[PDB]
Every structure is written in structure tokens, then in C-alpha cells.
Write a protein that binds this ligand. Sequence first.
Ligand SMILES: C/C1=C\CC[C@H](C)OC(=O)C[C@H](c2ccc(O)cc2)NC(=O)[C@@H](Cc2c[nH]c3ccccc23)N(C)C(=O)[C@H](CCCCN)NC(=O)[C@@H](C)C1
Ligand SMILES: Nc1ncnc2c1ncn2[C@@H]1O[C@H](COP(=O)(O)OP(=O)(O)O)[C@@H](O)[C@H]1O
Ligand SMILES: Nc1ncnc2c1ncn2[C@@H]1O[C@H](COP(=O)(O)OP(=O)(O)O)[C@@H](O)[C@H]1O
Ligand SMILES: Nc1ncnc2c1ncn2[C@@H]1O[C@H](COP(=O)(O)OP(=O)(O)O)[C@@H](O)[C@H]1O
Ligand SMILES: Nc1ncnc2c1ncn2[C@@H]1O[C@H](COP(=O)(O)OP(=O)(O)O)[C@@H](O)[C@H]1O
Ligand SMILES: Nc1ncnc2c1ncn2[C@@H]1O[C@H](COP(=O)(O)OP(=O)(O)O)[C@@H](O)[C@H]1O
Ligand SMILES: [Mg+2]
Ligand SMILES: [Mg+2]
Ligand SMILES: [Mg+2]
Ligand SMILES: [Mg+2]
Ligand SMILES: [Mg+2]
Lengths: 371, 371, 371, 371, 371
Amino acid sequence: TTALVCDNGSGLVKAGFAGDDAPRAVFPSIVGRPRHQGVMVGMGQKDSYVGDEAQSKRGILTLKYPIEHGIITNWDDMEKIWHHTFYNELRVAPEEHPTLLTEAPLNPKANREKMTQIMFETFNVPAMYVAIQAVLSLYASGRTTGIVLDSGDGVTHNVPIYEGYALPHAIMRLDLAGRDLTDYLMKILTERGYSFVTTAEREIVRDIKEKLCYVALDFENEMATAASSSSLEKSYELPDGQVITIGNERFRCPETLFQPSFIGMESAGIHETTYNSIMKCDIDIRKDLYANNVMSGGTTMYPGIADRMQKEITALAPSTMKIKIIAPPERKYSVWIGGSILASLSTFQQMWITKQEYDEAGPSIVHRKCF
Amino acid sequence: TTALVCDNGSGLVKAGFAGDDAPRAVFPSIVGRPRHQGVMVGMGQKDSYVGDEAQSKRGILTLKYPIEHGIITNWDDMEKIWHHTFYNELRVAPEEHPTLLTEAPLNPKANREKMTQIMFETFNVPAMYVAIQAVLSLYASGRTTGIVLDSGDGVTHNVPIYEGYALPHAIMRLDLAGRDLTDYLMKILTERGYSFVTTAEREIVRDIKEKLCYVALDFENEMATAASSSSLEKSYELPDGQVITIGNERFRCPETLFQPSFIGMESAGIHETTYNSIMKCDIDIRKDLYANNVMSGGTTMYPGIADRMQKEITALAPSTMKIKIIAPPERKYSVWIGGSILASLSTFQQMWITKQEYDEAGPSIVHRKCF
Amino acid sequence: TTALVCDNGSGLVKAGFAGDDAPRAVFPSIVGRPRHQGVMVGMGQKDSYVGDEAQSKRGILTLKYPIEHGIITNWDDMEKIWHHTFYNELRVAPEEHPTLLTEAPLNPKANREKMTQIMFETFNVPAMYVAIQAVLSLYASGRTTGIVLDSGDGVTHNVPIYEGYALPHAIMRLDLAGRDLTDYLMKILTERGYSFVTTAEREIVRDIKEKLCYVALDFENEMATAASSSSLEKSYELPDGQVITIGNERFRCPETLFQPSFIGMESAGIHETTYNSIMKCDIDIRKDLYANNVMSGGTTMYPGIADRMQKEITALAPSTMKIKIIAPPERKYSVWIGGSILASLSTFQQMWITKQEYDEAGPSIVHRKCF
Amino acid sequence: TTALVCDNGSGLVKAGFAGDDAPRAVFPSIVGRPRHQGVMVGMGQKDSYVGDEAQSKRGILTLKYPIEHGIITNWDDMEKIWHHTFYNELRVAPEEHPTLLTEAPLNPKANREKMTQIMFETFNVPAMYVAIQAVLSLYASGRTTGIVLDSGDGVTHNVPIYEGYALPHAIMRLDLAGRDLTDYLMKILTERGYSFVTTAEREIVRDIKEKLCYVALDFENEMATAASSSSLEKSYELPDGQVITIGNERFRCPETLFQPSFIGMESAGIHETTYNSIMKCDIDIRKDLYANNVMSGGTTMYPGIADRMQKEITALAPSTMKIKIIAPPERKYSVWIGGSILASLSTFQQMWITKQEYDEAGPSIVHRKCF
Amino acid sequence: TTALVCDNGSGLVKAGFAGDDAPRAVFPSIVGRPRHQGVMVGMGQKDSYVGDEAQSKRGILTLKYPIEHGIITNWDDMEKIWHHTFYNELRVAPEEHPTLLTEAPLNPKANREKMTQIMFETFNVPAMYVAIQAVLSLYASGRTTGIVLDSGDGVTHNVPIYEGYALPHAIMRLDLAGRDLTDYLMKILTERGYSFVTTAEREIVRDIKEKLCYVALDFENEMATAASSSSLEKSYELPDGQVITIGNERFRCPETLFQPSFIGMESAGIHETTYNSIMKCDIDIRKDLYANNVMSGGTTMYPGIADRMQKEITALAPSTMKIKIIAPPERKYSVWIGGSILASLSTFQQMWITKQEYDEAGPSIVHRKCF
Ligand SMILES: C/C1=C\CC[C@H](C)OC(=O)C[C@H](c2ccc(O)cc2)NC(=O)[C@@H](Cc2c[nH]c3ccccc23)N(C)C(=O)[C@H](CCCCN)NC(=O)[C@@H](C)C1
Ligand SMILES: Nc1ncnc2c1ncn2[C@@H]1O[C@H](COP(=O)(O)OP(=O)(O)O)[C@@H](O)[C@H]1O
Ligand SMILES: Nc1ncnc2c1ncn2[C@@H]1O[C@H](COP(=O)(O)OP(=O)(O)O)[C@@H](O)[C@H]1O
Ligand SMILES: Nc1ncnc2c1ncn2[C@@H]1O[C@H](COP(=O)(O)OP(=O)(O)O)[C@@H](O)[C@H]1O
Ligand SMILES: Nc1ncnc2c1ncn2[C@@H]1O[C@H](COP(=O)(O)OP(=O)(O)O)[C@@H](O)[C@H]1O
Ligand SMILES: Nc1ncnc2c1ncn2[C@@H]1O[C@H](COP(=O)(O)OP(=O)(O)O)[C@@H](O)[C@H]1O
Ligand SMILES: [Mg+2]
Ligand SMILES: [Mg+2]
Ligand SMILES: [Mg+2]
Ligand SMILES: [Mg+2]
Ligand SMILES: [Mg+2]
């Protein structure tokens, strides 16, 4: 009846209905299991906990993420998350509405084929479609031309779009994402003697990162300042009441996005990746892509990311070029919003894969580009 | 028919039926034998006396405790106690009801294996189960999360439980218990010239301890006060009418629980043991364990123990943490009560070791964790 | 057939049959011999006289007591007494009934071994047993707990018994007895010019003591009163019609029992001896022993002994203790009665030393404690 | 003059001079203090005992380890150990030779900064350097490529090295180490009724572990065998002459290294940790790392560890890959030996931090990577 | 000037000067008073007699011991003994030398406080110290490690010492001592008809014990032998020329030390007490304590005590343990000798309580442990 929109982002499930300006259900993409004992099956105990349950009880659970680098590998856990998304969070049977899913570009074909099989055989979804997140993000901004840099939990990717058309030969993908920034920070923090090694401890570091980190406009000068100025340090209170101090780690973590070599990657930084995607595009397109660099995704939340990227692109770009970073306060939900918008358009209504077409055509249909 | 509950606590047998809010049979875990002469077997004399008999006639008997540090070592005497518990105190044949027994954690495997053999071969018990006392105590409070400090006659132990799950790597056990506090007091009292050296005299000191001792909130200031203030002294009338005066011994005895070094132990005090058990638990669990420290067992009867423990944990705990000591007027019977509750639950009804399963499986079955 | 009971008390033989509530034969334990001439063996004259004969003819006989301080030393005279007890007084052959004898505690082993040899070799007694008098006295009262103070002619002794058991480490024995009280009075009376130096004269003093003496409740005040009040004096008529006056000697004689130093002893008085025996007993026993101090034996006949002992024990005892003196009108025969009772019990019937066991085991059997 | 090499390993100090093929001074990293009384300061008594003294007198001392999980926390005790290492064991003044120290990777920066301050301000060391143990261990083997698994007393760590270069993004660290294996065994042994709770008792368990434990090649089959076969049990004689029997505990203890969940950890087993470190390395490096897995450190002493690790890596590794475990009889001293070798090289002679450079540069110099 | 050493042992005063290898003054701790008459104060008569006077005139005196179970209760008599020790036996004014006193462990605090008050207020002693006898005895042997069993007249005690340190939690005290052995023998001897009931008679029994008793290596076999062999009997000549025969009483008396139940005690025998004190000590200490069991005190004079104790400890000890009894010919004076040694050491010279410190600090100073 109303298209259902579900962004199976790494680390976070965002879902709601088309026409809604926000997801209704927002919870971690986490499935947890008991760590220290078995399940008291003859008593009030469960085999697994999901999303908010997984977080509330995280101190006794081993937590797993079914999605790694944007690819679903743990299909059983992925179904558990969907099972709750549909029946406990949105509380809607799948048989009632068509569903729009999202995906990072350049994944295994199997990832689409398996999501499709599940949505038609485990959940009886009337029709479905799987969209690229960068495209939806641009729909959310309302522009037809620009380059979208979606930097999430598992994948960072750049998809230039011009006058509504994709420029696929220029799509670039990095493995570096929020999951790695968290892991890097866990390692950085051992320098101050704070050792976080368990899964729940990983979740704490993630929370620290989210509240304390920022992007230095000038890393070296910020670091030189940090070396002597105590004004850089901030305290953080841990769940058990202990208090720790975070210093230059507040900006050394996100710096990884500009310098991937910090974690051993040969990868381009986000400002080099963006630049190269633009350079792979036609000379008469480049002007507009520089003019409209569009940010989206949770890692773009670090304060100052917009200014640092403006500086870096400007430095790489021709001196007579106008460079602008577009970074609305709603970047975190850009994909979800784009989903809601697209799902409600009369043009999109013609692109759905119905169950009947799927059953007759088979899995190859998921690679259909109807438009 | 009705599960029978029997807490074979060191120094005291507490038994009754499931569904009863109190034990029906409460008597000392003591077997006595004549000290000065043989048994007039051709006349009205016995070889041994048990429980109340052992106490009423204690002046002519050598008394023994079959349980040391929570471990049954004198199996013949243990059977004599059970023989009376079933046939003279509760006056029920074992063949009529299933029986729930209790145990301290981390004992020899043999202790469970031997109790089981006796309950199926000497007493024909239809089915049985042996539970950990800390767990039962938490059932009695009705909470699912908290740390239970059971401090009895032979063992003091700490078992953290979270959301119904055990956290076994954090179980801590101390040897210090009520039996040692009594022995320490017997030694302290020689300072005033009161020498208690026989077994019956030990029982008198135990009675003195029970009526006069308290926990100083501040040991050093209480002691400094005691040094000059006569208001600290209390009289006690001995069974033969002689009267003695007890001074600072009233609080020096229980202080041992906070300072085990007084009796030569390297052991943590009860407030350090509790704290460390909490620190061995996951950071996202610790908050609730601090919030709910649950006391149980006879040594927690000393007036003021709740306030002294509150002070000590608070001092060790983070300053932003909420610490609360839970110490109901019924702590002495918490294990028994938990026994009654568990025994009546439909979940527990599935966990019993039946005689038939025992006979086929053998003794290894006692280590079964059905739940 | 019927056990024969014979109490070979110093100075007096009391014998009868088990089941009889009184001895049938009561006569002095005295053997006399002619003093002034030889025996007219060719005429109607005897070599010796026994018991009543010894008393009726005492003015011409030297009289001897075969028992000194409870120990038989003159075995030939002891046999003469037994010879008459069996054949002239009870008129029963020893071969017809088993015999129960009595003894003071802590005597030479030989005393039991010799009585046994005589009873199996001179008198053909089927079986025998030698009992402690304090024990029999307690049987006579019917109590199982109490301390018995048997004060007879040759020995005074204290045997605490608790719940039917002996407490042998607390048995105390004094040499002071009725024989000494008589000798002391003979010496006191020389003060009034009445000199009694022969054996028959000793018997007269014994008779005077028996009729005139009493225990002062308060010796010093009684003596101070006696110093000026003629109401204290009593007359006594001697066998030859002469009349003498006895004054404060009436209470100075029995006072010796409270003050043994009057006759040169280091010994405890009877109230100190009783007290110390109780103090040597376990603290949880002492309460009952104070509650039941049981008197027996001929020296307890002095009027007022019960009240004086009540005063003295009360003074030594704790102020919150209940002290009671048990002193029935039948104290003089308590041992004999206890003998009759024990002899008739089915438990006692198993404890007898038979002649056959004696002949095979030898004399060591007399120290058997069958019970 | 000659570089001094000192491996401040947790639980054991190994020191000697560069060029020496073995440490000269090997003693426990233990500082002990009197447990039952104060120090008789006016007599022949000490405040503390160190190393061998701490062990010889351990029955009266509380013993402490200044190093926990590879981190020095008790700096005063650490200086006492160094004080003896230099003046009593090696008997060399620090002013005479430069010193090479060792460290686990990923520690607090402060650990290096504090060791440096002590070595320049308390001990006047001419120059110093602090090396990573895994690196030294590889120098000891003589290889330039391989992965080193150093498993000691407080830390287990994996540092892949390729063609002389570190691959730091793949360094993995576990908390599980010999100290935990000992604690686990102390808990396992309560099953047989052997309770070790004091510090000296901990040292006994450590000795038991060292002589009796081995790694099962197949844990489940070894355990199933142990269940019925008495050939598994071994006796051990305790210091006081008592004898105890150890059964399957001989292999259940070291099994923890393959299954850390036995002690509540979420940690990878040693064979998973090694495997993952290799997988984090470049695909063209992995082949050599599989070929050369190098073991070092005291926990690798358990007999059979080499074969069990060979089995586990082989199972995880590709089937066409050659996997080899390198485990020389000298693994226990690999770090010390590597120290001696490096210290004598002409390349290393250029890397020393001199006192003068330290005084001018300050503590940040300890993080210098001169090479 | 020279420390004075005075061992106020129960029943015997041993005193001399530090540096002397023997006491100069050795006499009974006895105060006697006239028994049969008053004091002829207008003639050559005294109110009391002390020590040797008390013994020479014992037949007319009641003798008292001011010390019972190691505790001074008759303070007036204690001063009379000290009065003679200082002025008639050593003939030294107390004002001239500092004095070292001895004490049994675990006495009333008052015993030290009162001895101190007397030594500073009745006798003007410059300085004093009160030492534990077990400690001094070990000084006399010259060992620093061993367990000392001091068995004297009123108290038997066991104080383990390791490497010069006390292990106070393992101090054990028995009431059984030489005074009880004497009383038991007085009771045993009534079996042969020898009744000793006065105080002087007690002294005779003490002399008999000292010359005739021995410890059976094997009590039951010695007793079985004694039952038929006349070679066991020995004669003894009494002060009045009468001769008595002592048989198995020669070994039944000292047997009490191994079997305290003979006199009604629940107490451990001396070999059980020693064993338990060792078992209460740390496992790494026990080996040396078994190796060095040190005997001291007058009751260890019975011939054969060393061999019987060797047998008993060996039987209780582990079979691989080396057990040795140390029992020099000088055991009787070990405490005195240790006193002389300690008193002369430069370390001890710092531990004295001076009169000035006492006057300012008050009685609590007597519990000072300066060392
Ligand atoms: C915030 C946080 C910890 C800090 C607690 C407190 C507020 O601060 C300190 O006290 C710092 C203080 C400090 C000590 C010394 C110094 O030279 C400089 C610093 N660190 C230590 O003791 C460290 C030591 C440690 C253990 N393995 C490590 C691995 C790498 C680095 C350090 C460690 N230790 C006990 C923890 O990290 C523990 C447990 C880790 C192992 C679990 N298997 N971890 C936590 O609780 C988590 C939530 C992290
Ligand atoms: N303010 C913030 N700063 C840094 N990281 C953030 C912030 N907010 C969210 N994140 C990170 O973004 C990721 C989730 O955001 P999102 O892009 O929605 O993930 P996904 O699209 O994979 O669901 C997490 O890694 C989270 O820590
Ligand atoms: N009010 C009290 N104060 C101190 N100790 C007490 C008190 N009441 C009981 N106890 C002690 O508690 C012990 C018995 O209590 P309990 O915990 O039930 O023992 P158990 O569980 O071993 O049977 C005894 O050591 C007893 O002296
Ligand atoms: N009423 C009395 N007052 C004082 N003494 C008495 C009295 N009656 C008996 N006796 C004394 O008691 C002794 C005999 O009593 P008894 O106890 O039966 O002696 P035994 O038990 O030795 O045969 C004699 O010494 C006698 O004088
Ligand atoms: N044969 C062995 N088996 C098991 N553990 C051992 C063995 N030898 C030594 N160990 C353990 O190794 C640790 C000390 O070795 P080492 O690696 O040198 O420690 P560190 O490097 O921390 O000084 C201790 O925990 C010790 O018990
Ligand atoms: N050879 C011996 N055999 C048995 N007992 C002895 C011997 N010598 C002395 N005694 C006993 O030892 C006690 C006195 O010795 P001692 O230990 O010096 O006493 P104290 O230390 O109390 O002064 C007395 O009880 C005495 O009888
Ligand atoms: Mg996303
Ligand atoms: Mg209990
Ligand atoms: Mg009588
Ligand atoms: Mg190491
Ligand atoms: Mg002595």
C-alpha cells in the first residue's frame, strides 16, 4: 500500500514508510548471544538478543554485525534483524507493502540475489527494489548534478551523477569506514593505558568517538598545539562511573579519513578519492561536480569535516574553480530520506520487481535497470 | 509430592517443605558423644546425641561438626543428622517427597557425588537436586540482577548474577566465616581472663557473640572511644550464674570480616572481595551490581554490618556510582526461602535428577546443568 | 534367688533382701573380746562376741572395728561379722542368693579383690557385685542428676552424677567422718571433767552425740548465746544412773564438719568440698548440681545440717543460682535402699560377676564396669 | 663498555651481558613483605625480600608482582628489583655499561617514559634503549621473515615481520598469559579438594603446572580417555611432604590457550590470533608467514604445544599452504638471546638514547625509531 | 648495671644475672603458714615461711602456690617471694639492675600490668621487660626456626617461630602441666593404699614422680608387661623411713601428657597440639618446624619423653618428612638461659620499659612490641 523503506546500513537499521520525513525505527544492526553460560531454556532466557536488546544487555553478550564492508555474510542474523524490523519495530507484515532496500555500489552479485530471495521467500514482500545509496542521497538533496560521497559504517563510496545520469566508470570505493575509525581509536587509546578489547568495550569506544572527535582543520598545527595545551583534553564518563581523559586522540582518529596510511591502507584519502572521481569524468562535467560535492552518511558527522574537505579539494582543484561542500544537518539520514522520496514518485512506481516477475525471470532480474 | 527443602548449612540445619515461608525444623548441625565414661549399654544410655539433644547435654559431651569450610567430611555423622531431620524433626519418610539440597560454590566434586549417593542409596529419595546457595538467596530477594554475599558458618562467598545469568569467572570464595569469628573471640577473651577451651565452652562463646557483638562503623574511633568510655561494656550471664563483662571485644570480633589479617589470613576483606568480584565483571554490568549488593547468611546478623559495608564499598566505588546494600530482616533464612520458592516453580520441576536417571548415568549426573 | 543386699558400712551392718524397703538386720560392725580374764573354755564362755552381743557385754570387752576409713583391715573379724550376718541375723545360706556389696570410692584395689575372694571362697556366693554407695544413694532418691554427699562413719565422699553418668574426675573424698566427730567430742568433754577413755566409754559418747548434738545455723552467734544462756544445756543419764550436763559441746562437735581444722585437718569443710566438686564439673552441668545437692548417711542426722549446708552453699554459689538441699527423713538408709532398688532391676541382672567368670578371669574382674 | 641486557619479563628477571649466550642472573620478579608480624627493626630483620629471598621465605611473606599484563604499576618495587639486579646479581654499577630493556607492544606510553626516567635519574645509565620482545625473538632465530608469537607471564603477542620490516597494523595482543593459566589451574584443582588460596600456595601451583602440564593434541579425545584411564594421573609431592594426584587437570589448564572462553574471555585462541594476524597482512606476504610461525616465551614450554599449534593452523590455513611451527629448545630465553645479539651489532650501536640526548629532548625521545 | 633475670615459673623461682650460665637462686615458689596454732608473736615465731623455709618446715605448714595455670592470683604472696628473691637469695637491691621477667602466652592483660606496677612501685626497678618463655627458650637453643614446646608446672604451650618471626595465629595452649600430673599420681596411688591428702604429702608425691616416673615408648605393651613382670616395680623411701612400692604408676602418670582424657580433658595430647600448631602454619614453613621440635621445661625431664614424642609426631607427619626432637640435657633451665642471653644483647638493650616511660605512658606500655 505504502512503500516501506529500509536502509540496511552497516551497523544501523533505519526504517519507516515512504512519505515519512524520518525513519520510525532506528536501532543497531546487531545480534547478540550469551557469553558466559548456556541458555536456560527451561526458564526465562533467550538464545539471542537484537538491536536495543543487544545493547542493553551488551555486558553479557558477544555481539556480531552481520554486515562487513557493506556485504551481508551472516544471513541468519540478517533475517533475525529483518524479522524484528518488520514485526517488533515497524510492526507491519511484509505482505502489506512493497519494499525499497539500499546497497553500496560494486558489491558481489550474490548480495542482491540473496536479499531478493529472502524478501520473496521468507518474507512475502509484494514487490521490491534495491537502490544505490549515493543515488538516493542525491535525491534527498534535490539536486540532479553533483558528486555524492556516502561514508558510512562499512563502505565509503563516490558516485558522480550529472543531469540525472550516472557516470559509472568514475565510481570509486574505499574500504575505510566508521568501523575502522573505531578500531583505530581503540588502538590509539592504549597509549593512555585504556584498554578496550571486548565487544561491549568496542561499543563504548564507538560512543566516545561519537561525542568527542572532530576534524582538525590543520592536523599538524592542531597536533603541535595539543602537545602543550591542556585545553584540548576532554573528560568522558564511562558506564561504570570511571572517568577517562581523551587528548589529541579526539582528532587523530578522524584524520585517518584524510590519511588512510595510518591504518596501513594504500587507499586514497577521501579528498583524493573525490578529486579523482571528478578527474575521471568529462572535462565539461567537472565544473559542476566541483561546485557540488555532497556529503552523506554517519562519518560526516565529525564537526569540521566540511571545512577540512573544502580546504583539501580547493588545494587540489584549479585556482579559478569554485568548490563548494554541501553538508546539511540531516546528512546522517540522507539515504533514508532519499528512499522515502523515490519510493513515492510515479516514475519509481514503474520500476518495482514484483514477485510474479521474479518467480518467472529468476534472480537475474535483480540487475534490471528499468528506469 | 511436595518438594522437601533442606539447607545443610554449616553449624545449622534448616528444613521444611516447599511452599512453607519458613523452615519447620531448625536445629544445630551437631553430633555429640559422651566425654567422661562409656555408654551404659545395658541401661538407659545412648552412643550419641543430635542437635537439640547435643546442646541440652553439651556439658557432658564432646561435640563435633561434620561440616568444615562447607565440606562434609564426617559422612557417618552427616547421615545421623539427616536420619533425625527426616524421621524426628520433619517426621517424613524420604520416599514420599523429592529433595532440594544446598551447597557452597567451588567445593570438591566428591561432596556432590557423595550427597547424591546417600540420598539415593541410604534414603530412598525419589529425585533430588543440589543448588548453589547464592543463587537461591537471590531468588528469595526476587531480583534477577545483583551480587550475593552469603556469609555463613563455614564459607563466605560472592556470586554475581546478571539478568538471571551467572558470571562464574567472577565467583570468589573466602574461608573466613562465623566459625572463625567465634574462635577469634575465644582467643580475644583470654585478655580479660576468661578462658573457654572445651567444646561446650565454645558454644557459650558463640552465644555471647550472637547477643553482644556489633560492627563498628568506624573501628578506630570506636576503639578509641572504648578505651576511656565504660558505656561500651556489657554484662553477660553465664549458664552457671557467673557474670562476665565484655568490652571492646564486642566489635573487635566482627571487625575480622573487614580485616582478615587479624587471624593471619592474606584474604581480602568482605568489602574487597565484593568489590573485586564486581571489577572482574563486564563494565556494562558493574553499574547494576554496585546498585544491588545483597546480603545473606547468619554472619550478616551483626547490627551495623549493612552500614559498614555501605561505607566501604562506597569508598572503593567510583564517586558517581550509586551503591546500595540490600539487607532485609530475613537474611538468616534467605537460602531456605529461596529453596522453597525454586522448588515450587514449574521450571525447576524439569531439572530434578531422578533416581532412575542417576542409576543409569552414574554420579557424573550431579554436575548436570539442565536449566 | 532374691538378691541379698549387704551394706558393710563402717560401724554398722545393714542387710536385707532386694525388694524389701528396709534392712532386716541392723547391728553394729563390732567384734569384741574379753578384757580382764581368759576364756573359760571348759565352761560356758566364748572367745568373741559380735554386734548386739558386743554391745550388751561391752563393759567387759575390748571392742574393735574391722573397718577403718572405709577400708577393711581386719579380715578375720570381717568374716566373723559376715558369718553372723548370714547365719544368725538373716539366717540364709550364701549359696542361695546373689549378693550386692557396697564400697566408698577411691579405696585400695585390694579391698575389692579381698571382699570378692571371701565371697567366692569362704561363703559360696553364686554371684556378686560391689557398688559405690554414692551411686546407690542417688538411685534411692530416684533422680538421675545431682551430687551425692554420703557422710558415714569412716569416709565422707562426694560423687557428682549427671544424666546417669559419673563425672569421676570430680570425685572428692574426705577422711573426716562420724568416727572422728565422736573422738573429738570425747576430747571436748574433758573440759567439763567427764573423762571417757575406754572403748565402752567411747560407745557411750557416741550415744550422747546421737541424742544431743545439732548443727548451729550460726556457730559464732550460737556460741555467744551459749556463753550466757543456760537454756542451751541438756542433761544426759549415763548407763549407771549418773547424770551429766552437756552445754555448747552439743554444737561444737558437728561444727567440725564445717571446720575440719578443729581436729588438725587441712581438709575442706563439707560445704567447700561439695562446692569444689561442682566447680570441677563442666559449666553446663553445674546448674543442676547446685539445684540438687543430695545428702545421705548417718552424720546427716544432726538436726539442722540441711539448713546449715543450704546457707554455706548459697554463700559460695553465684547469687542468681538456685541452690537446694535434698535431705529426706530416710537418709540414714539411703544406701541400703538404693541397693534394694538396683538389685531388682533387669539392667543390673546383666552386671553380676558370677563365680564361674571369677574363677576363670581372676580378681581383675572386680574392676569390671559392665553396665 | 659492554651492553647490559635486562629482560624485565613478567614474573622473571633475566639479565646478563651482550655477547653472553645466556643470562647470568635469573630470578623471580618478586618482592615480598612479612605477613604475620612487624619488622624487628632493632634486630636482624628486613622490610622486604627480593627474588630468591622472596621464594625461600615465601611461607611467611606476602608476595607481589610489580608487573601486571606487561605493565609496571608498582614502581617502587620495580626499583627494588633493579637495585638487586644491578648490585647483587650482576654486581655491576649501571654507570659502567649501556642498557637494553625489553617491552610488550601496545603498552601505555608512560611505561617507556617511566622506565627511561628511572634509568637516567635513579640509576645513572650512560645510554639506553627499549626494544620490543617479538623483534628480539626473531633476531634470536636468525630469520628476517616470520611471525613471532611471544607468550609469557603477563602478555601474549603476535608481531609479523617481513624481510626485516614490521607490519604494525597486524599486531595483535591478548591478555591471556601464564599468570592466568596458573590462576585457572588453582580454580580447577578445587575439584579434587585441593585448595590453594595464599600467595605462597599460588607459587606451588605454578610449580605443579610447570612439571605436570602438557598440551593435548586432541582435547576431547584426551579428555574422554582420561575419564576412564588411570594412566593419565600423576602424583606430585608438596613442599611439606604431602602427596596429591593430578588427573586431567594436566591438560585442561593449557587448553585455555586454545579456548580462552574457559576463563570468560571473548579473545581469540592463540591459533586464531596467529591466523588473523597473518590474514591482516598482504596476500604476497602470507605465504612466508605461514611457513615460519615462530614460538617464544615460557608458556610455549608445555610439551606438545608445537604439535597442537601445527594442527590448528593447518586446519585454518589453505590446503595447499605449507605450515611450519618453529620451536627450538631455547624458546624460554629467546628474548634474552635476541637482546644479546642486537646489543652487539654495529647498527644497533647507532640507535641508543644517550643521557645527554634525553636530558635535552625530554621523554618524547623514548618513542624514537632511529634504525 | 647487669640485667637481672628472674623466671617466675610456676612452682619454682629461677633467678641470676645476665651473663651467668645458670641461675644463682633456685627455690620453690611457695609461701607457707602455720597449720596447728597461732604465731607466737611474743616469741621466736614467724607468720610465714618462704621457699626453702617452706619446704624444711612443710610438715607444720599449709603451703600455697601464688601462681595457678601461669597466672599470679595471690599478689601478696607473690611479693613475699620477690622480696626474698631480691634481698635474701640474690641479695641485690632492685634499684641497682634492670629486670627481665618471663610469662606464658595468652594470659590476662592484667597479669603483665600488675607485675609491672609492682616492679616500678614496690621494688624500684630502673627498667623492665616481660618476655614470652617460648621465645627465650628458642634463644637458648640458638636456632631461629623451630617450634618450642615449653611444658612447665602450670601451663604447656607451643609457639612456632620461623626465621626469627612469630607465627601467633598458631599459638596453642594447654592447661595440662606438671601440677596436674602430680595430682593425678596422688589419685593413682590410692589404688595401692597410699593416701596422700595434705599439702606436705603433695610435695612428697611430687618428689616420687621426679625420681621414679618415665615415659613408656609403648604404653599398652609396657602396661601389659607390667601386669606380670615384677621388674617394673621400684621402692621409694618416705621421709619417715617407711617404704612404699610403685609399679605401673611410674609410667601411667606421664602418659596423661599423651592422653589428657585420663583426667577428664578434651584437650589435645602434647603430640597432637604440636602437630596442629604446625598444620596451622604455612605449607612452606611446616618442613622446618617438623625438622626442629624443641623441648623445654621441667615436665620434659621424664626419661623417654623425647623418644615417645618422636614416635608420635612421626606417626602424624607425612612419611617423607624428616622429624627430629631436640632435647638437650639443659631443658629444665632453657628459659632462664635464654633470659641471660637476650638480656645481654645490644638489640634487647633498646626494648626496655624504663620507669620514666611507664610513669608517663601508663600500664598500656606493657603490651609494647618494640623489637
Ligand atoms: C577506559 C578503560 C580503562 C581505564 C580505567 C581507569 C579510569 O584508568 C586507569 O586506571 C588507567 C591505567 C594505567 C596504568 C599504567 C600506566 O602507565 C598508565 C595508565 N590502565 C590500566 O590499568 C589497564 C592495563 C592494561 C591491561 N591490558 C592492557 C593492554 C594495553 C594497554 C593497557 C592495558 N587496565 C586494567 C584496563 O584498561 C581494563 C581491562 C583490560 C583487559 C581486559 N581483558 N579496561 C577497562 O576497564 C576498559 C573499559 C578501558
Ligand atoms: N557524530 C558522529 N561522529 C562520528 N561518527 C558517527 C557520528 N554519528 C554516527 N557516526 C558513525 O556512523 C556510523 C553509522 O552511521 P550510518 O552512516 O547511518 O551507518 P550506516 O549507513 O552504515 O547505517 C557508525 O559508525 C557511527 O559511529
Ligand atoms: N545475630 C548474629 N550475629 C552473629 N552471628 C550470628 C547471628 N546469628 C547467627 N549467627 C551465626 O551464623 C551462623 C549460622 O548461621 P547460618 O548462616 O544459617 O549458618 P549456616 O548457613 O552455615 O547454617 C553461626 O555461626 C551463628 O553464630
Ligand atoms: N542422729 C545422728 N546424729 C549423729 N550421728 C549419727 C546419727 N545417727 C547415726 N549417726 C552416726 O552415723 C554413723 C553410722 O551411720 P551410717 O552412715 O549408717 O554408718 P555406715 O554407713 O558407716 O554404716 C555412726 O557414726 C553414728 O553415730
Ligand atoms: N615448562 C613450562 N611449562 C609451562 N609454563 C612455564 C614453563 N616454564 C615456564 N613457564 C611459565 O612461563 C612464565 C615465565 O616465563 P617467561 O616467558 O620467561 O616469563 P617472562 O617473559 O614474563 O619473564 C611463568 O608463567 C612460568 O610458569
Ligand atoms: N625429672 C623430672 N621429671 C618430672 N617432672 C619434673 C622433673 N623435674 C622437674 N619436674 C617438674 O617440673 C616442674 C618445675 O619445672 P619448671 O619447668 O622449671 O617449672 P616452672 O617453669 O613452672 O618453674 C615441677 O612440676 C616439677 O615436678
Ligand atoms: Mg549507509
Ligand atoms: Mg549457608
Ligand atoms: Mg556408708
Ligand atoms: Mg617475556
Ligand atoms: Mg616455665
